[PDB]
Amino acid sequence: AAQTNAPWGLARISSTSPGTSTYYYDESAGQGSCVYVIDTGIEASHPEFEGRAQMVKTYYYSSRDGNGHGTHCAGTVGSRTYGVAKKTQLFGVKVLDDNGSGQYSTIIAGMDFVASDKNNRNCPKGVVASLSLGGGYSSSVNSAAARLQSSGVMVAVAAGNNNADARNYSPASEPSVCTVGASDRYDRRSSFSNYGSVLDIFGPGTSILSTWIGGSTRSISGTSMATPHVAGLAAYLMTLGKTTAASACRYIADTANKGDLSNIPFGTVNLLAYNNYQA
Ligand SMILES: [Ca+2]
């Protein structure tokens, strides 16, 4: 399938080179997979989600996304225009309040929720979790991310936006999950992207157009935006049968565009998520 004039990030993910605007993907499109977006929530009623999004959990007085951040991330995972996996099921878990903040304790509970909750969902092709959040190193946060992953969920997390080594951030520093740095449309490491040995992959993160609350759209930037590209890619690849929750991060690293990014610090992977789709 070919989507013309796609957001640059979608195009980049199906391309061997920067500077193209069409997104290419197998039409299975992540059908029969599920992605949990653990964030400020999802505006499920947005036309771009077509009935495939649902709020499953909140730790606050409402499950609505009163911020827009979670809705943007979800749109990058699986909205029809702005999404990588255009046919996936999207499940929202609101661990972040409408200011985009959340106590580590609520975030942990949300991770443990998904690990159980996937048993109440229909996801024959596999389960993915997108965590576009983080804070200072916490062994308890990392451990919760490691449980989610061990339970059979492909866990993708933001490296963080401090232009710093991500070893000092959680869940970014957890070895067993997929830690995602941010790149721009000229294949530069995004100026704010964290780096370091704990990174597994880069995805598009600068000037990323996606869904917003109030049924609209906007372009915003962060390893928050890169993460759902990789989460959506894993879902897509899982439905294609190419990989599984336990091996998807490795598989993505293995099949990535390699050596193409600029301003990658010595010791950080130079790998850009790529779907290797042959139209
Ligand atoms: Ca990692």
Swiss-Prot record:
Ca(2+) 1 binds at residues 175, 177, 200. GO terms for biological process: proteolysis. GO terms for cellular component: extracellular region. Keywords: Calcium, Disulfide bond, Hydrolase, Metal-binding, Protease, Serine protease, Signal, Zymogen. One of its GO terms (molecular function) is serine-type endopeptidase activity. The keyword RNA-binding does not apply. Its EC number is 3.4.21.64. Its cofactor is Ca(2+). Residues 7-279 form the Peptidase S8 domain. It catalyses: Hydrolysis of keratin, and of other proteins with subtilisin-like specificity. Hydrolyzes peptide amides. It comes from the Eukaryota. The keyword Disulfide bond applies. Ca(2+) 2 binds at residues 16, 260. Binds 2 calcium ions per subunit. It is an enzyme of class 3 (hydrolase). Hydrolyzes keratin at aromatic and hydrophobic residues. Belongs to the peptidase S8 family. This is Proteinase K. It comes from Parengyodontium album (Tritirachium album). The lineage of its organism: Eukaryota, Fungi, Dikarya, Ascomycota, Pezizomycotina. The gene is PROK. The chain holds residues 106 to 384 of 384 of the full protein.
